[PDB]
């Protein structure tokens, strides 16, 4: 099933973000779920256990993942700012402005998955499509 075929990628990602531990630190669990486009409300966060293991993650992921639009939250800004070809510079400006953990080198990896070589026009619907393709 869509769910069972994701379980491989969910297991891989828990191992990568926990550095192959049994239990994953909370700040790392937020990155882990965000990496598959999942965002909770503060009320859902309050119900999370502090001791998170692989099995919790796998049930959490199978329920909260959006099978049809994994990166909906990227295209939900399109309701705010409609599909526009942001300048490669203007898009870097939007990223470094909002507090971000991604370096210019990490920005190049983002450019390396999304542009790929056009180096001209980038709409948020390609970057969501490119990022789903590389799951």
């Amino acid at each position: 099933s869509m769910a069972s075929d994701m379980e491989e990628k969910f297991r891989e990602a828990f191992i990568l973000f926990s550095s192959c531990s049994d239990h994953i630190e909370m700040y790392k669990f937020f990155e882990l779920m965000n990496s598959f486009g999942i965002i909770l409300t503060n009320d859902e966060k309050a119900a999370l256990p502090n001791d998170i293991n692989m099995d919790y993650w796998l049930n959490f992921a199978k329920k909260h993942y959006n099978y049809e639009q994994p990166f909906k939250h990227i295209n939900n800004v399109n309701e705010q700012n409609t599909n526009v070809q942001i300048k490669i510079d203007n898009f870097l400006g939007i990223m470094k402005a909002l507090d971000t953990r991604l370096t210019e080198s990490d920005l190049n990896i983002l450019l390396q998955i999304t542009n790929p070589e056009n180096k001209s026009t980038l709409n948020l619907k390609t970057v969501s499509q490119k990022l789903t393709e590389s799951i």
């Binding site: 297991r11 891989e12 191992i15 550095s19 192959c20 531990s21 049994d22």
Partner: protein
């Protein structure tokens, strides 16, 4: 190749083929079984290389070629531990059985949970595994 003739028993090459051949040909799966019985260690890379050349079913000569690319002379403890070293977070040179099981079953030519837990129980009865020693044991 002079590296093959030196490492494997030449009579056991002929015989293992006869043990598994059919219509003058041996299946890649069987050639890999023979390679392991001879003390070689093919990967999926070695199976993909011979399949691109000859297909699923090997003549005796095609089978001798497959055994020559399965030699992998460069393999030592330094080259095997790279993935365990990556995930060793305490710099102790040990990983738990769960950690090794997850590493062996997630990536590459993944083992099944059983194949992995069997290989690890065969090496040690203790939860902490000296990954350098584990790689020494499977190499010899």
């Amino acid at each position: 190749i002079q590296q093959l003739e030196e490492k494997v028993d030449e009579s056991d090459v002929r015989i293992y083929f006869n043990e598994k051949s059919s219509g003058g040909k041996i299946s890649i799966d069987n050639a890999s079984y023979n390679a392991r019985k001879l003390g070689l260690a093919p990967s999926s890379i070695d199976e993909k290389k011979i399949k691109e050349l000859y297909g699923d079913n090997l003549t005796y000569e095609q089978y001798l070629e497959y055994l020559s690319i399965c030699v992998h002379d460069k393999d030592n403890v330094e080259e095997l531990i790279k993935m365990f070293a990556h995930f060793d977070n305490n710099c102790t040179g040990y990983l738990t059985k769960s950690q090794m099981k997850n590493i062996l079953t997630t990536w590459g030519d993944a083992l099944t949970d059983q194949e992995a837990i069997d290989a690890l129980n065969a090496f040690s009865s203790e939860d902490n595994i000296d990954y350098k020693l584990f790689c020494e044991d499977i190499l010899q």
